[PDB]
Amino acid sequence: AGPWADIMQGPSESFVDFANRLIKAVEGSDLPPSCRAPVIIDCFRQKSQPDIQQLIRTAPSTLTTPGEIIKYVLDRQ
Amino acid sequence: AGPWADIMQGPSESFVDFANRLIKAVEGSDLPPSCRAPVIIDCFRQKSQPDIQQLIRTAPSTLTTPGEIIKYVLDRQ
């Protein structure tokens, strides 16, 4: 699919649009299935727009899946 | 350490300098130990300068570790 490691949230892209693009690229990648979720998490933390990076880092340590982080961000927009 | 998913080979950087920076950042990351090598491999394929990306994709399917890919590239420079 798309080169997942190149994906960053662009200035006309919402967080969720970026999350969806990123996840699709990771799912289509050659990565071991068990690495998908931690790579997605790291890319949300590092590759979203800076304001979103700053919101994600306020999330509790108990939020450990991509879906939990997505709900955390969208519920605060 | 450094945000590994942001790392790309810059125009004044050699391939090996980029590989070393990338690997250090991945080693310092929160990634599961078993995901380090496949993430490194993917980042070499996607985040090096375009001419290097094109050289890496000529490598045999038998080269499966970061070190094998590093030797493949450096031995051809």
Swiss-Prot record, chains A, B:
<comment type="function">
    <text>Self-associates to form the irregular polyhedron core composed of hexamers and pentamers, that encapsulates the genomic RNA-nucleocapsid complex. Assembles as a tube in vitro. Binds to inositol hexakisphosphate (IP6), which allows the assembly of the polyhedral capsid.</text>
</comment>
<feature type="site" description="Involved in capsid protein dimerization upon acidification">
    <location>
        <position position="42"/>
    </location>
</feature>
<comment type="subunit">
    <text>Homodimer. Homomultimer. Homohexamer.</text>
</comment>
<protein>
    <recommendedName>
        <fullName>Capsid protein p27, alternate cleaved 1</fullName>
    </recommendedName>
</protein>
<feature type="site" description="Involved in capsid protein dimerization upon acidification">
    <location>
        <position position="30"/>
    </location>
</feature>
